[PDB]
Design a protein around this nucleic acid. Sequence first.
RNA 1: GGGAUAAGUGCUGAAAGCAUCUAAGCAUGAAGCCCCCCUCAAGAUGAGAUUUCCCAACUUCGGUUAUAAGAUCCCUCAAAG
RNA 2: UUGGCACCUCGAUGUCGGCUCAUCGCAUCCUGGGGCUGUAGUCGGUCCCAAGGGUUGGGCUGUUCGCCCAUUAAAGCGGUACGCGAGCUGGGUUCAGAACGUCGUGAGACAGUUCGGUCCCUAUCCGUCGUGGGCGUAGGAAAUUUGAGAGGAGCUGUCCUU
RNA 3: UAUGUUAAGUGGAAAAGGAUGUGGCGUUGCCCAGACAACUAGGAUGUUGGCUUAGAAGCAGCCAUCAUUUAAAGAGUGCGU
Lengths: 215, 175, 122, 37
Amino acid sequence: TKGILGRKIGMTQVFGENGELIPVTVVEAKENVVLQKKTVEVDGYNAIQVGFEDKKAYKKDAKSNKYANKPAEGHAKKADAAPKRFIREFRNVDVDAYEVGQEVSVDTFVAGDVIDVTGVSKGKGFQGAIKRHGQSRGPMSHGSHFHRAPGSVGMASDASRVFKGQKMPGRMGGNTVTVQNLEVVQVDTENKVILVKGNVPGPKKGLVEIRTSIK
Amino acid sequence: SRVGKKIIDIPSDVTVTFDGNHVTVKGPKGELSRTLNERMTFKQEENTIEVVRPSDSKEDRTNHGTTRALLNNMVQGVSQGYVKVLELVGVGYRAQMQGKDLILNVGYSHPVEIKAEENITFSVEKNTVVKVEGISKEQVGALASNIRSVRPPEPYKGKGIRYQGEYVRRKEGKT
Amino acid sequence: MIQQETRLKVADNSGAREVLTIKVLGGSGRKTANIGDVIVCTVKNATPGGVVKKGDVVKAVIVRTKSGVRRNDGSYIKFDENACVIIRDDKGPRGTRIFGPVARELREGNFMKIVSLAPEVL
Amino acid sequence: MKVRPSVKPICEKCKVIKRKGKVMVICENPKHKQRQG
RNA sequence: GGGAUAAGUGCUGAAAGCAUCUAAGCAUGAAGCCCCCCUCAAGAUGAGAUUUCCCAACUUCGGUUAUAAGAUCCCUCAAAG
RNA sequence: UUGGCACCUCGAUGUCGGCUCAUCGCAUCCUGGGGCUGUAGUCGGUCCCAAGGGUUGGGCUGUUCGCCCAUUAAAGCGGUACGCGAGCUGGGUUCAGAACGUCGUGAGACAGUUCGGUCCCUAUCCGUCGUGGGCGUAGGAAAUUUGAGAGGAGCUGUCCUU
RNA sequence: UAUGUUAAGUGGAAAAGGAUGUGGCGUUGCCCAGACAACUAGGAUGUUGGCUUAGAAGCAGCCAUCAUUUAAAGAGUGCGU
Ligand SMILES: [Mg+2]
């Protein structure tokens, strides 16, 4: 129940009661709107589709994602809302509790809620075995010519091949990651800010999805 | 199947309905409905029932003896009833009712609760002698086994939920 | 961050002046230890006399590392030198005259005889 | 329980039975329980 | 935390008027099996679903232009490479 | 394992250890569940079910092995060319130098020691790890998706209470 | 097609041994005077008499092991120390 979409601002620190250092992540969640209601009899499953941020209206000869195209404007005009930059949907919520066009507000969460936050992790690009997979490195001296290579990729003539999933170098980062059992520290309704405890995946100004802990 | 053929069934003021293969037996304490072996044939005289097998093939002469005693169990449990009594041995072992349920304190740092089911009654006496009563033998036996399995008897002092009149092999381990 | 083969000054009058850590107790794969962690160690330098003699294999509890500890409020404490105190397998000291400052984090590990016997607990 | 290729009575009270395709011995002495045969 | 099991423990019960966990029938039972949790996924050629956008005027019969909705070329860049 | 045989390979199939990276079996080292016990409890013993995960760091040797020092819930046994040198090393071993013991008249020899002694290769194909384009998915698009399937995780200590 | 066998996926790898699995053939002795079953009917006597053994009277071992109260009775079939 009670999910929301937002973007990560950065990390900071707050002092709790009894004064403990609480590292927090600031999440800005503003202009969240319900754009569709997926229903079992129409879609096969129940969910609420939530749009987040605010695109500019359609214009002739737009050259970037800043302006809604006609498909998106029409979709967001079926509910009564402005075009949105990020559209997700939520299954853990009760669809009947929500109404199309309504505004998912920040104070749906209350301090002490236990949440799951989903983001896209920070990109790292083409990375080698010891960073991408935590593998140990070979000796750096003693005549060694094995420093950061991956080790053997297999056996000998029995196999005569490399098995699937060998942990070889490649593009690190940029994956969907869910961090579980984080808790909201406070909610700021005027700034539309949720302070989550700890850190969440993704670069600053990315996109995070907060929803109720599934555990 | 001497069990099946020789000893015929003797209803006593009960209503048996040989509704095809599905049998239904009702009397003073309830109604029981079981689906007996298909191939077997049933002859019902005035307050008497008899089971007849088709061939003397080992299988037929095995289901015959089974499905005669099964029906005898229904009539005897619906006319007379079935009871199983369990004794609790051990300092501090108690049994108390909590409303359609049975609570036991058998030295486990936590009480153990068995909820009763339909057609089954529990009772306690002297906080030790648990009693399970019902019409169906195959369910009273199951419940009694469940209750004794909470803590079956131990060999060195006999403590535990035992069947009444159940021999407990007693060892003599020493401190 | 005290690991094996780490030299430590001993901060009591037990007899041992320096020890080297053979192992950090507490689990398989455990590599480092901080204040309040117990280590097994061999004494490398001793005073003439005292109950602990050079070459003995003894238990000790770490006091005042130079890596320091974080506290729940976000306050850190660090020291100038790694130190340790030889314990009697009941978390009680062998010496009688613990010297030097001692971190307050030892009060939790029930090293109360060490904590009370220290000139300064911080 | 004794699970061995040779399942035989050990006492006069031992019984040889077949459960679920296995040859077993059951006796009032628990030491004489045997499983496979 | 559910579902089904292994070794095991059984209840009812004949073969074998007794006994018997088994044949018929009904339970219970493991870090293991299936689900639950995380991630990827319709090239799932079986290519799925929902919402929304676009919609004509020549034909001499489209084997049809060029355009809509939408993209891109090219240019300023980085949270991405 | 030590062997037997001589069937592939001498117009070359690099042999020991270690490193890096694993993967599989179960005859299970730990953890999970049991039966029996000459099991009073904590401790054990033995057998059964179970391969999900886990299964230490040092001293000495080139060592595998082994012994020892400290740990640990435990420090499992095996296969994969005694897995893996177009991934690394090069201490052992098996050229040319020198020496000791010993044997030989001698040249020299010993699986007896001892000191020293060049480890080449820009990846075509399959395979593997990452990333793009084409066409298809019976109009052309933007977005949100279901989940057939697939992968990942899966360990465990101590203390307090009862 | 006819007649039988197998229930183990045996068929679609092994052995010593182990087994109220199952079918066939013959021998054989119990029997409506009524075996086999628990047939819930009695079980003991002088008498462990004698070696009586840690005292031990179906157990540490030589049995001497006499008739039956009795429809059927053993100085106790037998679990035991
Ligand atoms: Mg060649």
